[PDB]
């Protein structure tokens, strides 16, 4: 579940890094829709990245 994500970004985008890692282990509240923001600003610098949802 982790190596397959890094493999797609290293071939379809030719970049081992630039992987947006959003951990959902702490966002378990009713007001979590305002801080994600984090996900909107992570892909703003580079529109050609990947999004990963852990847990």
């Amino acid at each position: 579940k982790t190596l397959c994500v890094k493999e797609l970004a290293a071939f379809l985008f030719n970049d081992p890094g630039a992987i947006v890692r959003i951990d959902m282990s702490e966002y378990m509240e009713k007001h979590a829709v305002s801080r994600l923001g984090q996900l909107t600003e992570a892909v703003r610098r580079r529109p050609y990245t990947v999004v990963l949802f852990d847990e």
Binding site: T2, R21, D23, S25, D54, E55
Partner: protein
């Protein structure tokens, strides 16, 4: 369980320290005597410890719920 599943994988080694065994207490006081001798060398003071002083301090300084 306190951290994340992906955070424990980035750690190289997970060294877990063990409890100080009573057999290793004799080697603990041997290290502290080296720091005392190197401080008294400037004043030409030779400190010597017999085989009876290290045995008495080993059975009295044993504290497993606190260490050394």
């Amino acid at each position: 369980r306190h951290f994340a599943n992906e955070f424990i994988n980035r750690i190289d080694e997970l060294i877990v320290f063990n409890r100080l065994t009573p057999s290793n207490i004799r080697k603990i006081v041997d290290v502290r005597l080296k720091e005392v001798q190197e401080r008294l060398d400037e004043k030409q003071i030779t400190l010597d410890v017999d085989d009876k002083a290290k045995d008495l301090l080993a059975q009295q300084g044993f504290d497993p719920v606190y260490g050394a």
